[PDB]
Amino acid sequence: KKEVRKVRIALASPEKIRSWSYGEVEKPETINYRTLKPERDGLFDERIFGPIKDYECACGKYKRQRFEGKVCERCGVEVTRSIVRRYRMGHIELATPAAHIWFVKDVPSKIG
Amino acid sequence: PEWMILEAVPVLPPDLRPMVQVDGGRFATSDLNDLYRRLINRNNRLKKLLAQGAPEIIIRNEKRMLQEAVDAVIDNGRRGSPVTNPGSERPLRSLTDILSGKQGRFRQNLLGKRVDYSGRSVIVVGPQLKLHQCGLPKRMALELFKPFLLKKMEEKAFAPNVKAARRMLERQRDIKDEVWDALEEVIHGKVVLLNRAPTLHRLGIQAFQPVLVEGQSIQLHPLVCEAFNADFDGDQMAVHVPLSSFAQAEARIQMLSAHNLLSPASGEPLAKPSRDIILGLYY
Amino acid sequence: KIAQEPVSLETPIGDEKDSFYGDFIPDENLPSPVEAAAQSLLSEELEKALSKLSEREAMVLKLRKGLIDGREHTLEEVGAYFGVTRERIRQIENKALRKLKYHESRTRKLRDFLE
Amino acid sequence: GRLIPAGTGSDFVRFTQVVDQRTLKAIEEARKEAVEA
Amino acid sequence: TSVYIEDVLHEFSTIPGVKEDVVEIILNLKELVVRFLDPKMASTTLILRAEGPKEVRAGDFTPSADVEIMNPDLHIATLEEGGKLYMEVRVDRGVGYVPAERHG
Amino acid sequence: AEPGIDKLFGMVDSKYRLTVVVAKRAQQLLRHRFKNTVLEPEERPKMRTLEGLYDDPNAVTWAMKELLTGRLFFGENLVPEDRLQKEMERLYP
Amino acid sequence: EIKRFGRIREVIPLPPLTEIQVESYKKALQADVPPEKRENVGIQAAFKETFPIEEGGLVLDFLEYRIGDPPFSQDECREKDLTYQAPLYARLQLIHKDTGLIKEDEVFLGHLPLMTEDGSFIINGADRVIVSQIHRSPGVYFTPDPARPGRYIASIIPLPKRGPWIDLEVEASGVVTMKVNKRKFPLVLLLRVLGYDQETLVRELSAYGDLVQGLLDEAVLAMRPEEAMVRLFTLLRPGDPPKKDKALAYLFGLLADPKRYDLGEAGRYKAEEKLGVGLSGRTLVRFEDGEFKDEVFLPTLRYLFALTAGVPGHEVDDIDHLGNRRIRTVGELMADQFRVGLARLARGVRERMVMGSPDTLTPAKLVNSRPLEAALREFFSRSQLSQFKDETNPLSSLRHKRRISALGPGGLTRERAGFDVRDVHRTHYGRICPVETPEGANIGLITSLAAYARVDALGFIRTPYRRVKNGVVTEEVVYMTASEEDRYTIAQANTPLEGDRIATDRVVARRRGEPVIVAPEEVEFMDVSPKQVFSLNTNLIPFLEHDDANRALMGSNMQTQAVPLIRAQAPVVMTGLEERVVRDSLAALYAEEDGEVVKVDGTRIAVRYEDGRLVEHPLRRYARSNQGTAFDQRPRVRVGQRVKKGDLLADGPASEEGFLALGQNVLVAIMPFDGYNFEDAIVISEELLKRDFYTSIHIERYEIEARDTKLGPERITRDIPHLSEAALRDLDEEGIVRIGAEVKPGDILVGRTSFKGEQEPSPEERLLRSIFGEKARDVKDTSLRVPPGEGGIVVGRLRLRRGDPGVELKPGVREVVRVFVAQKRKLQVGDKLANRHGNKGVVAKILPVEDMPHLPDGTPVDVILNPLGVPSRMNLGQILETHLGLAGYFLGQRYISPVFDGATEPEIKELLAEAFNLYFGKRQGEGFGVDKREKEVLARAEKLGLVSPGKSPEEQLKELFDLGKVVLYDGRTGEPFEGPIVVGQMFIMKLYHMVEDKMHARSTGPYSLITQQPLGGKAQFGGQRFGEMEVWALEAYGAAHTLQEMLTIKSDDIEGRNAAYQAIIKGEDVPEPSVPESFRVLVKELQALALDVQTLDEKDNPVDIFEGLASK
Amino acid sequence: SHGARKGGADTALRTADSGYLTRKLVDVAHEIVVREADCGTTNYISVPLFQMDEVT
RNA sequence: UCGA
DNA sequence: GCATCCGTGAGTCGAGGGTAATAAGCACAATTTAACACTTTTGTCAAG
DNA sequence: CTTGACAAAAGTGTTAAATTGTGCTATACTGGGAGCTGTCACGGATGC
Ligand SMILES: [Mg+2]
Ligand SMILES: [Zn+2]
């Protein structure tokens, strides 16, 4: 709805990454070897990144576009287009805060 | 500046780092997934033995491992031996690995791209062609212009609607004369771009009028063959079709091989008598 | 079969160091440009062929197949708001169905979409 | 993936207008329609 | 125009007791001149039965009305001992050169 | 080539301006399906086909031949873009 | 008939070409060699070195290995997709040191792929091949100092990975340092453990004068080996505390250990003779009595100081020199992987010994498959030297096996390739072909073994040279390596042989590669035949001396691209080497003894030999290959007749009668024709298509797999829910296409039925299902349909279902069906064509037989090439091929003109003279005379001075004829050409590339999963890629919406291609795109790096490019 | 063949360096487009038609 | 690893 | 300042062919999922 | 279109059968390991 003539690149604060994040992926799993469904906290989890099928909720209680955007009460997924799994990012909270290696090993090291 | 030391590590969406099974019952996945996996693993184990009150040595070492894991996710191989899947030499491609590089998201998936409505083939001499004309193989041209031909089959009877003509063209290639003429009904007046790699001079791409002709070979005018650097030893040339009337306007006007004559480099003529022509006109 | 592990998309190819793996994998989980106009054409032509039915039965059909609220309506429900019995709704949609079956055999517009 | 700053997408030539006589005089007449409004 | 053998599914598959393969014989099949004595005859069919250790030829076909061969010495295929062959062709009159791929 | 291309290049300063003109005009010709044309019957560009000779369906060529007469008008910020589409899609279906 | 030119006769025939594959693989095999007398090198070398295994303690010792019979024949391994291999049963013994428990039980190792007769392995059912490798041989070397303008630098190198490069360069402060694996240290602290102390160093060091002090240091010359052993250990590896035993168990390995240090036999031997010393093992030093010895550093320092003392006989040797470079043969590489695999297994034994039950364990429990079998499986499949065999024709493979590459593992890479490796050294000569090599970035990187070139077991290549004693040719032929050759002075095969003695007093000869005129006295050697200086394909080019190196290279390289033709004919003028070619290629069936043909039977050619027993040879007729090119053997023998041993029976795809035939001999006319031959293009007579000339036959494999899905299993049947009856036609019963059927693109070869993953139909789709009442069954149609651009009949069908005998199918997969689809491709418009002389082109507008530039006899020309390409390319070989062919068409005899030996202008002109004398004879004899048009041409031909004036038109057309030029009448008009046109028989080849394959295009289709861009290439059925420079070009034209569309609408844009497609379908103008997709992907990717990237508008306010998706 | 094939390799490498210079030329001068009809500057340079032949 |  | 070390590149489109490999083991609690007995709707039929 | 009688489809509750997660083994075991070379030009940080 607006012309974009400008693009800025800047540093992202931890709070900003928190804002982007729909959840913290904890379980270092992909999918169960049987169900092939995204694991609970797994990196593919639908409960955060969104549904694999368009508007079809994970557990399957909500299906069509009728109810839209409303998070279900079972799996906790949102009912929306499956496209979201492309644009929706998570986060991992580190116990000991680490450093972005770019600024460390950059030729004119910025921290240094 | 303290943002440079990061607490919460951003995680790329599933479809950006996909895992999907192909035909044959296989499974395929991105390396970024494995990287993230080891990262979060070390992180959780860390938190576990940390809050547990384990000895400082193991804790510290785990912190170090967390740092190098984070680095493995950010830029892999930037420090020390790059992390590789067990048994295999190939390093895991991380974020920075994807961004930068010859095949990086810019030089590969941005500054150039694979496009629809296009194809290519071997080239053959154009002695009957006049300049802006180019031989375009029937077969190639039909499937190339399919979205247009569908409309011209919509207007011109024979099948009731789009889907009809579609299925008519797909299965059972009858290619009734009706479609050979209808194709030309949507063709004439519009020109397609012809490209010869390498593209060095801008003249490496020139607008040419499609002419439906037999054979699977593409006919090109002998004069502009000099500009393209092309010959026929079996050289191959690309064909693209401008869609919107705007792009078609640009094509027919300033991209036309007939409308570009002099060399944009030296200002002198580009396509002139060459080889045979010179020989005869001399003789 | 379960023993084997997934294969990286960063897998090289033959003599060429440049050639990757995942660039060979198509996206079938997203509608193809042809499928968009396909479903569009279906949803359109169907609506055109729907208008030849009684104001009730035509509505009842799309209420039954979920072209309205996106959900199936049991005969009980379709008859509840119409005041009619379930059996009535049943006969209604049957009759309407075959009354469509008359026009379709003629126009041959929707005789496509046969997969 | 936007319109290239150069070429026909140049801000110099991209604001060009095109009108045919009859329509031009239609909108030309539409001007005096607002003077009584 | 066209040919048929009972032992042959295509221009490749080998016939027992025949040195020449199918398309190798077909190479010499179109080299056969057959004159139509009948001006009104647009079609015909030639019949051949050759068994045992004999070398077949053009003059070995089944002679019929309104057809004759100007080169009976044209070699079709060699047949060894025990090799048996049944062949039938179909001949039409036309103009110029029409490739096999172009005609059904 | 396209007949009158030298003249067309001569009609405007930048060739790109010409391209923009032809593009927009062809667009307009597609919108109303040739019923907005400034061309008379003998002026109508015609494509010859075995079935019959009809008006050339290509809109770009139509725009070319159109501006060739100069019966059209062009320039930067000529008229408000607002009313430009209001009385355009009005006059023709 | 036939005819041959040239004086020089090869005194030796070309030894079998396949040997370097098979024979050198044999030495590493020793299959029929008894377990006793085995050579100990190759297979046993990788064996004996990996034994014994020692670490209450145990020693595992080696005995022997059994060569297993092949589990399946070479044929069956293909159909089954199984590697062609055989069980290797290893014999060893488990010996308890202290317990005195001796338990000997023979065990099993794994399967080792064997080699066929032609020297091609079969891996995964598709036969592949292993190319030879090239690297400078091991040993020690001496080069001038790169930095220092002064004295020189020595070096010591082992086999690849078999030890560190040991370098020593005298630093100039006047002192000396030694560099091995990026580090610095004087020689002064080295020899302490080598048995040389302060005094032992300075003794004969003074023989070189000023170089003594180079090695002296008073700090380290005090201390003794055990004290200074840890000294260097704190330097090269400061990754752990400098313990005294830690320098004992570490540095020992880098030298004294025969395993982790193995210096090649060639290296040990050559360095032994070049240092004027001797060496015991393959190590640098010996480990004995707790200290170390030195057999290496002492002689290498001796020679370094020698050369730097300027003493004659000690000098710098060239690096790229072929005497300093060896070849890695197939067997050598085989052992090279075998040893490392066996080492991984050697440590597979270690940890196996330290657990379980140390009391009684048979060697059966101590031995494993994996650390070897996987190491062998990793090699043949994924090694850069092992790849798809070239089956495009027999000569294709025959040459492919003889190629030498400096690339691959152990070799070099394109990034490091310099003019040194790319150049042809002065000593190349008859060892390596100076011309044949790729025209790409691989120039000089991949060469071919020269004709008479042979590689011994040491890797050094040598060429046959006949010795000569006082101008007398000795019948003794010698194989001399590069240095060996460099000693003597070698004459030329073209030297004036007077009948076994030298004739003229000026003899062409060289030394080291330096051409000199040499007296009949000083000449000690001469090369057998000039043919040895060139490889196979290069040697297959007649009049090679008249073609530029470039075009010759191109032609010889193109002979590999050759495809078999059904009617294919042997060349009129050939070098005469085509005989041995089809033989050593083993593509043809000859007589093993002196027999008689009992029956022809183009399946079974049966011959009873002199020994009385009948041996029949079956035929492979009409079978596939790697390139699709059909392999066909046409029996040339009558129902009965006598056959001597070695005489040909069947034929081969490229073979006519036993002569290599690539393309066909046709009639070429050199003249520009209506601009159609413009820029090396080619026009062809339509009369070719009628005569089935240049018509080939190609087959293709199509396979399909039905597995068991999670949703449910799959099966191969004829039943499909929605299918139309007409398509099921050619499928007999089980749902497969039957033999000899007609399959057009889009038709189903093999039906597959798979239960669809579901969900439900959309409301509109569901109602549509209600109208017709048609139920969509669970299972749907996965059937494999023949891809577009290809199709034809079916010569064969291969059915393999799991649970069947002899076939083990991959886990979770039920059925696999593989159809062979063959097509007869006739020469088309735009198809690649070439001759042996390096002249390329495609087919431009085949012209009707009606209009052709024919001759007086009314016989039209087959091709009409364009002369323009000739003077630029400087290939006159095609001119002479045409000239000889012109005579060959009449005289009816072929010709043999060997490379740098053969026909000359007077001889050829004589042939044309005879040919004309007969031709004009038939003319006047048939009741004719000189044509008025002929006069019309002869006039102007006389005016320009082409023919001598005053002579009758007989003599004029004669003088014109032998020139190669004749009178030509234009078929279009019928009036002749204003000047004469050289014509004749040229051998022309139809190259691989064809339009039927290379053609392609797309509207809408597959898109990548990562980004929404299509998939480049014909396979995926995608669209072309728009390069960065194409983009640049579009920017240069200043076409905004063209480039914009390229970057969005037709490439990655989500709704761009969709709304566009709908706009075109509805007859509208496509709207303007919004989001590139992959740009957004780029954005989120950046966000993963914690880069905050915002799109502002004009005012610096954020705009959502994700269209309200991730907003949260 | 000694120097010939060498020349082949020469052209081979230089054709690779060609893109090396090209793409960088593009990446620098890319933003250059004709904007103003006239920049309106008095600034200029001359172009000597005569070149000095050294040592002559 | 070939085609241009 | 002057030698050395680390970092970054290096040409364009295609054509193909593609995928190897696991030495801990057992007992039991915790859920999860397939099994199954019987309920409430839903769809269909006959006659009105 | 309506009223009642019924088969089949779909529901709902409890249970049998799998699948999955957790724990412990007490003779004494106390610092890994694999290495790989035949670039090349340049630009900046770092060290003499
Ligand atoms: Mg070319
Ligand atoms: Zn839910």
Q: Dump the DSSP string for G394-429.
A: HHHHHHHTTEEES-STTS--GGG--HHHHS--TT-T
Q: Tell me how many domains chain G contains.
A: 7
Q: G575 and G596 in one domain? A: no
Q: Are G524 and G606 part of one and the same domain?
A: no
Å separating the CA of residue B56 from the C1' of nucleotide J25:
33
Cα atoms found within 13 Å of the Cα of residue G487, Cβ hemisphere only:
8
Going by their DSSP bridges, the two strands G573-574 and G895-896 should be labelled as parallel
Cβ atoms within 10 A of the Cβ of C5, count? 10
| Token digits of residue G650 | 């069947």
Based on the fold, state whether residues G205 and G152 are members of the same structural domain. yes
The type of residue at G168 is L
Looking at the fold, whether G773 and G804 belong to one and the same domain comes out as yes
Q: Among the CATH numbers 3.90.940.10, 3.30.390.30, 3.90.550.10, 3.40.50.1480, which is that of F1-93?
A: 3.90.940.10
Say whether both G171 and G308 belong to one domain.
yes
Distance CA G440, CA C15 (A): 14
Task: State the smallest CA–CA distance between residue B164 and chain C in angstroms.
Answer: 7
d(CA G1098, CA G288): 82
For an interface test with B, the pick among A24, A37, A43, A106 (most B C-beta atoms closer than 10 Å) comes out as A43
Distance of CA A102 to the CA centre of its chain: 23
* CA nearest neighbour of G166 among G304, G287, G265: G304
Q: Scanning the structure block, which residue is given the tokens 């079935």?
A: F51
Question: Which ligand does the CA of B230 lie closest to?
Answer: 1
CA G444 to CA G743: how far, in whole Å?
45
Which residues partner with G61 through β-bridges?
G93
In a domain, C16, yes or no: no
SS (H, E, C) G327-396: EECHHHHHHHHHHHHHHHHHHHHHHHHCCCCCCCCCHHHHCCCHHHHHHHHHHHHHCCCEEECCCCCHHH
Cα dihedral value G933, G937, G940, G943, nearest 10? -110
CA distances from G922 to G856, G918, G925 (A): 12, 6, 5
List CB contacts of B262: < 8 A, sequence separation 6 or more.
Answer: B268, B269, B270
**Are residues G2 and G19 located together in one domain of the fold?**
no
CB G864, CB G669: distance < 8 Å: yes
Nearest-angstrom CA–CA distance, G259 and G688: 65
Contact (CB, 8 A) for G154 and G317: no
Residues in contact with strand I, defined as Cβ under 7 Å from any of its atoms: B 197-198, 230-231, 233-236; C 14-16; G 384, 387, 405, 407-408, 438-440, 442, 446, 557-558, 561, 840, 993
Which residues are paired to G508 by β-bridges?
A: G517
Write phi, then psi, for G115 (nearest 5 degrees): -115, 145
Let me know if B102 is exposed, middle or buried by CB neighbors in 10 A (0-12, 13-18, 19+): exposed
How far from the centroid of its chain's Cα atoms is residue G411's Cα? 15
Angle of CA points G558, G559, G560, to nearest 5°? 85
Number of other residues whose CB lies within 10 A of the CB of residue G272: 17
Return the ∠ at Cα G104 (arms to G98 and G105), rounded to 5°: 140
Q: Resolution in A, one decimal?
A: 4.0
The beta-carbon neighbor of A11 closest among G710, G1092, G1109 is G1092
Q: Are G807 and G125 in contact (CB under 8 A)?
A: no
Centre a 10 Å sphere on the Cβ of residue G412 and count the other Cβ atoms it contains: 16
Q: Is H16 annotated as a binding residue?
A: no
Determine, for residues G1061 and C33 on separate chains, whether the beta-carbon distance falls below 8 Å.
yes
Number of H helices, E strands in chain D: 1, 1
Cα dist. B119→B115, B193, B198, B236, C25 in Å?
9, 11, 16, 11, 20
| Total count of domains within chain C | 1
Q: Collapse the DSSP code of G1036 into the 3-class scheme (helix H, G, I; strand E, B; otherwise coil) and give the result.
A: helix
Indicate if the alpha-carbon torsion angle G18, G21, G25, G27 is positive or negative.
positive
Reduced to 3 states, what is the DSSP secondary structure of residue G823? strand
Q: Is D11 on the interface with G (CB under 8 A)?
A: no
Instruction: Say if CB G915 and CB G887 are below 8 A apart.
Output: yes
What is the separation, in whole angstroms, between the first and last Cα of chain A? 43
Task: Specify the amino acid at residue F26.
Answer: A
Q: Tokens for G816?
A: 């696999």
Partner-chain contact A82 C71, CB within 8 Å = no
Judge residue B9's burial from the number of C-beta atoms within 10 Å of its C-beta, 0-12 exposed, 13-18 middle, 19 or more buried. Answer: buried
Q: Which two tokens stand for residue C8?
A: 């990286």
Tokens at residue G949, please?
Answer: 């004036």
Both tokens of residue G208? Answer: 């070189």
For residue C92, being part of any structural domain is answered with yes
Structural domain containing residue E42? 1-104
Taking the Cβ of residue B261 and every Cβ of chain G, the question of whether any pair is shorter than 8 Å is answered with no
> Is residue G799 classed exposed, middle or buried when 0-12, 13-18 and 19+ CB atoms within 10 A define those classes?
middle
Do both G349 and G411 map to the same domain?
A: yes
In contact, D13 and F23? CB cutoff 8 Å:
no
Chain B: partners with 3+ C-beta pairs within 8 Å? A, C, D, F, G
Q: Does B208 touch chain G (CB under 8 A)?
A: no
Strand, helix or coil for residue G471: coil
User: Helix crossing, F59-69 with F15-31: angle to 10°?
Assistant: 120
Cα D33 from Cα C14, distance rounded (Å) = 74
- Helix G370-382 to helix G330-353 angle (10° resolution) is 150
- Closest ligand to G679 CA? 1
G18/G127 same-domain check: yes
User: Are residues G113 and G195 both part of a single domain?
Assistant: no
Cα separation of D17 and D31, whole Å? 18
Give the DSSP letter of residue G743.
B
**Crossing angle (nearest 10°) for helices C55-64 and G763-772:** 110
Angstrom distances, CA of residue A16 to CA of B43, C46, G1093:
21, 48, 11
Sequence-distant contacts of G1056-1063: CB under 8 A, at least 24 apart? G1057/B116, G1057/C33, G1057/G1004, G1058/C31, G1058/C33, G1058/C36, G1058/C37, G1060/B147, G1060/B243, G1060/C33, G1061/B147, G1061/C33, G1061/C34, G1061/C36, G1061/C37, G1061/G1004, G1062/C36, G1062/C37, G1062/C40
Do residues E80 and E19 lie in contact, with contact meaning Cβ atoms separated by under 8 Å?
A: yes
What single letter denotes the amino acid at residue F79? V
Q: Considering only CB atoms, which chain G residues are within 8 Å of A83? A: 1109
**Helix segments in G56-173, DSSP class H:** 74-79
H or E element in which residue G921 lies: helix G905-925
Domain CATH number, residue C52: 1.10.10.10
User: CA E64, CA G494: separation in Å to the nearest integer?
Assistant: 67
What is the side-by-side strand order in the sheet with G714-715? G714-715, G753-755, G779-781
Rg of the Cα atoms in chain A: 18
Give the DSSP H/E element, type plus range, for residue F15: helix F15-31
What CATH number should be reported for the domain holding residue E59? Answer: 2.170.120.12
The CA distance from E29 to E32, in Å, is: 6
Q: DSSP class of residue F22?
A: H
Q: d(Cα G922, Cα G913) in Å, to the nearest integer?
A: 14
Task: Count other C-beta atoms under 10 Å from residue B50's C-beta.
Answer: 15
The number of beta carbons lying within 10 Å of the beta carbon of residue F40 is 8
Domain that holds residue G330: 8-137+319-463+530-586
Cis omega before residue D5 (within 30°)? no
**Domain encompassing residue C101:** 31-111
Entry field: residues in chain F: 93
G666 class by beta-carbon count within 10 Å (0-12 exposed, 13-18 middle, 19+ buried): buried
Q: Cα(G657)–Cα(G636) distance, rounded to whole angstroms?
A: 7
Q: How many CB pairs under 8 A join A and B?
A: 126
How far apart CA G854 and CA G846 sit, in angstroms, is 16
Contact at CB, A7 and G1096, closer than 8 angstroms: yes
Q: What would you report as the CA-atom Rg of chain C, rounded to the nearest whole angstrom?
A: 24
How far apart are the C-alpha atoms of G351 and G353, rounded to whole Å? 5
Distance C16 CA to J7 C1' (A): 25
- CA dist., res. E5 & res. E48, Å (int): 10
- Is the Cβ–Cβ distance between G996 and G628 less than 8 Å? no
- Strand C7-8 and strand B28-29: the pairing is parallel
CA of residue G3 relative to chain centroid, distance: 34
Q: Domain check: are G728 and G809 in the same one? A: yes
> H or E segment at E2?
strand E2-5
DSSP string, A41-63: SSTT-HHHH--SSTT--SSSS--
Q: What share of chain C is helix, strand, coil (3-state, %, to 5)?
A: 50, 5, 45
The verdict on G149 and G205 lying in the same domain is yes
Sole residue written with tokens 């990454």: A17
Residues G745/G752, Cβ–Cβ less than 8 Å? no
* Domain total in chain E: 1
Query: For chain B, first and last CA: distance in Å?
Result: 79
Distance of CA G592 to the CA centre of its chain: 31
Length of chain H: 56
For strand G121-123 and strand G126-130, is the pairing parallel, antiparallel, or unpaired? antiparallel
Round to whole Å and give the CA distance between C76 and C59.
15
Buried-state track B168-183, b at ≥16 Cβ within 10 A, e below 16: bbeeeeeeeebbeebb
Query: What are the CA-CA distances from residue G604 to residues G159, G612, G618, G623, G651 (Å)?
Result: 50, 18, 4, 15, 13
| Beta pairing partners, G902 | none
Query: What is the residue type of E99?
Result: P
Indicate whether G1057 and G1030 sit together in one domain.
yes
